[PDB]
Design a protein around this ligand. Structure first.
Ligand code: HEM
Ligand SMILES: CCCCCCCN1CCC[C@H]1C(=O)N[C@@H](Cc1ccccc1)C(=O)O
Ligand SMILES: C=Cc1ccccc1
Length: 455
């Protein structure tokens, strides 16, 4: 029952590459998936991949005995500054399992209890900023969520204060990082990357990489000269030993991990919080239910770890926002051996796949006809959700190591936001999703009305 899969329109020797010549390539691929279905072929000079959109096929792709994590072109470009850190290493590179073993304890339950107080420090700065706005001033939502999540990973992970709420402009790190991600995304469609027309892009790219590395230098220097006894993510990077190889990380890999966690440890969580607030102001009945939980649970001026664990509806709100707009919107796989996908599509060893997460999460055979509605109650019973229907944090041993960190931070912050303020979609904002490999609303603004509850 071998089928021929469809393929979108081609451009001669450039094949499908010009389809990525847009500022919103993930959304363009979603529209292709709408037209072509659960699987389509995508070619560029020297490369072939297959985009999967249905739970029927993705549940097979998630079989770790058949498929391993592949570096997409995007991740290969990110590797120019993230090296063999956790997110851009191959599973078979020594430093992947070594760093995985060393850093997994930094995301245990006991570790999260240790980060909690510093998460509250940054969250309180967010609430105070909003309490201090004048009448009819508004909130720039993705901007302030990025201030929050960057400061949180800096303080919790490295005992470094980016002090983002003391800046009306982004931190230099953010400006360079966004420019590196922009360059990586735009480079995806470049047929002749070594054409001298891109000499300035290459120079600017190196300049943005040096800005990020300079900050890494300061974080490392401050810790090794510090007189304070820290037990955080950087402590494990500098001192943990891998049980398997017995070795600690070396200096080069440590630098790559710091870059990796500063980027991956804040950018997608700021997108999640932005999308969650968007869906809440567009669905006031859901906001009210979440606000009722926040008022009932957060009975102290400062939230505790145990109280955040009881914000169960807030957690469902966050999962439903990750269903509709997963902020790391794709991951890539390669076949470990010859195999047949769905009884219909034969693959050879080494053949690549792309998992298109926002389209997976719109599979009507899984979620029903109301798939575009925001309904957190979908997540009331994980046993009622078929396997591999919901993949916002990737798959298997290569799934997101920071998932618990992100969800604890986002649940804490969204809970405090709903405890302390009413929110108004005063512009009737039309959703506009900016792409930087990752996904985030652009131009989303709201007004907050203080409930005048002291901190
Ligand atoms: C809602 C927020 C987040 C989302 C949606 C998210 C999503 C993902 C996804 C989909 C992957 C797999 C990528 C692939 O297969 O190519 C991943 C990997 C990873 N993420 Fe996240 N992430 C989030 C927050 C974080 C945070 C806060 C950190 C750090 C504290 C983090 C650290 C990592 C690391 C290091 C990896 C690579 C793991 C490995 O392969 O060993 N993420 N994330
Ligand atoms: C870092 C957070 C998530 C990163 C995932 C990046 C996910 N891409 C972000 C933009 C589009 C999307 C994607 O489909 N990319 C492919 C593009 C590609 C396919 C075939 C040939 C050439 C290039 C890739 O990078 O290989
Ligand atoms: C998981 C890897 C990653 C890469 C770039 C931005 C955010 C996350």
């Amino acid at each position: 029952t071998i089928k021929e899969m469809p393929q979108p329109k081609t451009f001669g020797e450039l094949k499908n590459l010009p389809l990525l010549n847009t500022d919103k390539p993930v959304q363009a691929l979603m529209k292709i998936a709408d037209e072509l279905g659960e699987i389509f072929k995508f070619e560029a000079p020297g490369r072939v991949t297959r985009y999967l959109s249905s739970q029927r096929l993705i549940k097979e792709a998630c079989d770790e005995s058949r498929f391993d994590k592949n570096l997409s072109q995007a991740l290969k470009f990110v590797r120019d500054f993230a090296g063999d850190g956790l997110a851009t290493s191959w599973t078979h590179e020594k430093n992947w399992k070594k760093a995985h073993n060393i850093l997994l304890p930094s995301f245990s339950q006991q570790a999260m209890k240790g980060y909690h107080a510093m998460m509250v420090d940054i969250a309180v700065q967010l609430v105070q900023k909003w309490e201090r706005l004048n009448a009819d001033e508004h909130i720039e939502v993705p901007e302030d969520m990025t201030r929050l999540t960057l400061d949180t990973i800096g303080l919790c992970g490295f005992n470094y204060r980016f002090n983002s709420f003391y800046r009306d402009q982004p931190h230099p790190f953010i400006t360079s990082m966004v420019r590196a991600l922009d360059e990586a995304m735009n480079k995806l469609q470049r047929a002749n990357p070594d054409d001298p027309a891109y000499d300035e892009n290459k120079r600017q790219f190196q300049e943005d990489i040096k800005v990020m590395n300079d900050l890494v230098d300061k974080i490392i220097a401050d810790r090794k000269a510090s007189g304070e006894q820290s037990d955080d993510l950087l402590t494990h990077m500098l001192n943990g030993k891998d049980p398997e190889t017995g070795e600690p990380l070396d200096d080069e890999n440590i630098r790559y991990q710091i870059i990796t966690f500063l980027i991956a440890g804040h950018e997608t969580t700021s997108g999640l919080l932005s999308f969650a607030l968007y869906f809440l102001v567009k669905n006031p009945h859901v906001l009210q239910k979440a606000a009722e939980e926040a008022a009932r649970v957060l009975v102290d001026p400062v939230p505790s770890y145990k109280q955040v664990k009881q914000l169960k509806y807030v957690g469902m709100v966050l999962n439903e926002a990750l269903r509709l707009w997963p902020t790391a919107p794709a991951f890539s796989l390669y076949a470990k051996e010859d195999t047949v996908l769905g009884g219909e599509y034969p693959l050879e060893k080494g053949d690549e796949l792309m998992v298109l997460i926002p389209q997976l999460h719109r599979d009507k055979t899984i979620w029903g006809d109301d798939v575009e509605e925001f309904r957190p109650e979908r997540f009331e019973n994980p046993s009622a959700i078929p396997q591999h229907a919901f993949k916002p944090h990737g798959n298997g041993q290569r799934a997101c190591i920071g998932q618990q960190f992100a969800l604890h931070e986002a649940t804490l912050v969204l809970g405090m936001m709903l405890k302390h303020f009413d929110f108004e979609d005063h512009t009737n904002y039309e959703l506009d999703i900016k792409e930087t490999l990752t996904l985030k609303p652009e131009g989303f603004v709201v007004k907050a009305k203080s409930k005048k509850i002291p901190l």
